[PDB]
Amino acid sequence: KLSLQDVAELIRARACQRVVVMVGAGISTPSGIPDFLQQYDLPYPEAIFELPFFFHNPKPFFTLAKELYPGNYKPNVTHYFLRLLHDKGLLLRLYTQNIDGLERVSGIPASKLVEAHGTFASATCTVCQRPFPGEDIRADVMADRVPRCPVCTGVVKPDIVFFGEPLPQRFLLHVVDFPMADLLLILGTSLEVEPFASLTEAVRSSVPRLLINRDLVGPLAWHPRSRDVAQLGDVVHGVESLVELLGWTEEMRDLVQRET
């Protein structure tokens, strides 16, 4: 096995400069966003991202949308470390399962992001499929009213991907990004679930896979490879020690006070 310092030295050298990153809920809880009775009036947790429930009752989802609008949460060190990889020309693609939009907020350009469970930044009429900037429904949501299509009256839904829905078109970038990956960084998610779990195996056997996660689970556990590295513990701590090892301490502080 390699160590956190080796990976750090591989990046520091720029021997690694096409980094593919995959992130999940573990990077958001330090911003104070929860992951999980639940006061939202749901029959079960997943009903909040099901289309028939939503058609029957769009209110709980809109309560979450209102809560996740810009200004409730800020990015944390983990997002700002990813922004630094971008600023140093190292980021090939950032794949995110979160819907808090904090990757964009930390100033990572959209062209670098695959928001694989979608985004509140835009919205779509559930009936006639007309697209709308998320601004267009902001006031309705911010007032607890259900936003409606100005042509057909259909409920207008923010472009969060619900159960049973195709992943967004930009997800198709995985077909080129994962063979091109010279390094795979997995932060705050186990990636237990398809198609994300297989993506961990789409990189080239020569390519290190660095997990910064609490425990060691998922396909990094199930089908480990020679050049895997685990850095288990608090994600924030792990990223900070990676940052430390890269020598990016000052750059991190600079970026954090520039942005926040």
């Binding site: 991202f49 991907v161 619900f162 159960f163 049973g164 829905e165 992943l167």
Partner: peptide, 5 residues
């Protein structure tokens, strides 16, 4: 098939 889940 890539769908959410």
């Amino acid at each position: 098939r890539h769908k959410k889940x």
